[PDB]
Design a protein around this ligand. Sequence first.
Ligand SMILES: [Mg+2]
Ligand SMILES: [Mg+2]
Ligand SMILES: [Mg+2]
Lengths: 111, 241, 97, 125
Amino acid sequence: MREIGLKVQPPAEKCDDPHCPWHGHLRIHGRYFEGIVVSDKGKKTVVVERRHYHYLKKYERYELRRSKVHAHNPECIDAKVGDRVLVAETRPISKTKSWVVVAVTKRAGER
Amino acid sequence: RKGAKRHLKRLAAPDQWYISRKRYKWAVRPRPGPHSMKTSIPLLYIVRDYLGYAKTAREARKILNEGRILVDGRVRRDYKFPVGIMDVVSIPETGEHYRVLPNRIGKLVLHPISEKEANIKPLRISNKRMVKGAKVQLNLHDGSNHLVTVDDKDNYRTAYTVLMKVPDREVIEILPFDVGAYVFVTRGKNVARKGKIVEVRRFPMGWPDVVTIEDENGELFDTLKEYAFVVGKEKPEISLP
Amino acid sequence: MEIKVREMKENRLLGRKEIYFDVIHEGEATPSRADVKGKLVAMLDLNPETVVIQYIRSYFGSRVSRGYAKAYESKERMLYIEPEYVLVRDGIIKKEE
Amino acid sequence: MATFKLVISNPRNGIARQVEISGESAEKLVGKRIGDEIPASELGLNLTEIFGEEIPGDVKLRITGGTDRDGFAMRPDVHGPRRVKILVSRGPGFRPKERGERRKKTVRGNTISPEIVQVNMKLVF
RNA sequence: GGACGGCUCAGUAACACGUCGGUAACCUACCCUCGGGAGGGGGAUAACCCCGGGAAACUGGGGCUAAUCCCCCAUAGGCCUGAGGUACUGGAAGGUCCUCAGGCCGAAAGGGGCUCUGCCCGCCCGAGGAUGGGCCGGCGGCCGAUUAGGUAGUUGGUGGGGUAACGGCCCACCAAGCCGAAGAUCGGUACGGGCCAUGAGAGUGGGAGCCCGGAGAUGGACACUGAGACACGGGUCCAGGCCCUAC
Ligand SMILES: [Mg+2]
Ligand SMILES: [Mg+2]
Ligand SMILES: [Mg+2]
């Protein structure tokens, strides 16, 4: 089983589209982060949200900034709304999708 | 806009040239060639500014076309030719040889040397293709290419160094990238620094590998493996600074 | 006039001695290229057919001018390397029409 | 009128002569296209003609082109007696300088009309 | 070779710019290195000569001739697909390489010069590099709510086509997504930055001049050639205006 460049557990089942990194021919390159899923409606398409804090030099304070990313979701990793997914950058898959989910830590409960 | 660049403004020039940036408007745009723009300088600047054998580019071009300057044993008549790191610039009429190497400030300088060392050029291997005929093409940091066979393909590895006899191009003294190997840095913050290798870290994805290096005075500093140039097994053996 | 040489370096690539010198002219104007050339060939037994003066520059408040001259091994190298305006100035060449 | 200045060309000699016709011979030329042979016999001009020597048998003329009163050359590719303004890219009516110039040039059509002046004629043996 | 340089800041609130990164999703003439090759034929046409036409701009016919011009053939090579081997690099192989199949495309100037039997400048192919770009992404930088819902190829998917290349870029068929009160949409203003002015500083303001990038060449639209242009001193049309004219 292949060993895509960032050490994390692969899925259990091995049947997917060619747009899966592990079982297909899709490649990943560049940056990777963990994020929270906020939509899982589209077929093989989720929305992942980050939450970083931005410093304001003048007011000497911080503000939150949310950023969505629009990743690809292979059926082997059917991440749902709530799950802390790991996402990585790849080629364009669509107009908005240039990222792919690779791994999950599930979340049945949230706050 | 509509195509490529044929010019270079002397302020927009590389930071590693010793160029006098405000005296004129234009600079020599280097040709594509052996090395990169970040690790090179044109032969005109070497002939005119560094060595001072000409105050003028017309004189320098006359010299170069007469054929008085070799670069790795080969006559180079183009004034835009790139001269890069660890390159040997020879003037036989004067009996002089210089190694283009970087400074600690990060700029390129000519270190004087003699004939024996001047017939040597160390080459970081930097890649390894399998080419038709089932042969191995080593793709070297001066943009050069050397063909070897599937017998010593394993003696040849990517970050290694090869000493090369340059007017003939015969490999001598493969120097491997290992612990204890004497190394010369070429870029970065720790530029013209040298020592023995200590450690290598890998960094999963496309993040470059990093090497920890020990200097002569016992200090211990890191840089990139790609910027770590091997010059020896335990001693630099190429008369660096 | 008094000539006092600072530097005299050879150039085998182009084939010329490059002389940098001081002309002390206390009390007088900065001298002419003719007179400087004469004194220079005397100070150094050079071939005036090949000696060419690049510049004599006088500075502010000095009466010690600085000069750069060139001494070629061959007149043909001189005529090949050195530009026509310098040659005309030293009078080697009458401008060709 | 229907007058015409014919430049007759002998390829045997590589030589040419200009002869101006002015009447019913010209009117007989009217209506003919590039590619259309005609005999000098009926056209009127003699057979010991201005070439002097090397008299032909009764060799027949053939139209090759010509220009109009306003300076525009007939193009055989174009059908009719009227003028057009076309992109051409190499043709008669255009002398391209650059490699892919493609200028739009005014030309005249093949078939002769009263507006023609120069008429190029190769004599065909 | 003219696609650089040079000019201007209309437009643009955008991956345009800055910065970090990516291209395993791409092109690259000139240049470097390596490895190889240059075989066999053929043809035309300027210049020139004869005659011209047209007010000009421009342009015709015939004759003659060459090439590092053009065409052909084969050999190399290139691309696709299928099968399997696992030698290479990489963080990771739809990649490279090896063997075999079926096919399609398909080079070259052994030219020129010297001190000529050797040297110099050169032609083609392949592998890489370099140079210069294309494209993607994260972050980052105005105003307005007397602009609150917006979007309909619109968001995604399956399959394709097209492209140098990924991509709803386009198409067919499936679904109902996407954005938004942390302010979408719309409107307003504005080339972006490095920088500059000011001020104790915090900050406020500006972003002509130099560099970097971008865009544009009366407005609008479209193409040819070329490595590269949809081309300021090249082409075509519309609109608008002007000039010469034998109208
Ligand atoms: Mg062929
Ligand atoms: Mg504006
Ligand atoms: Mg104007």
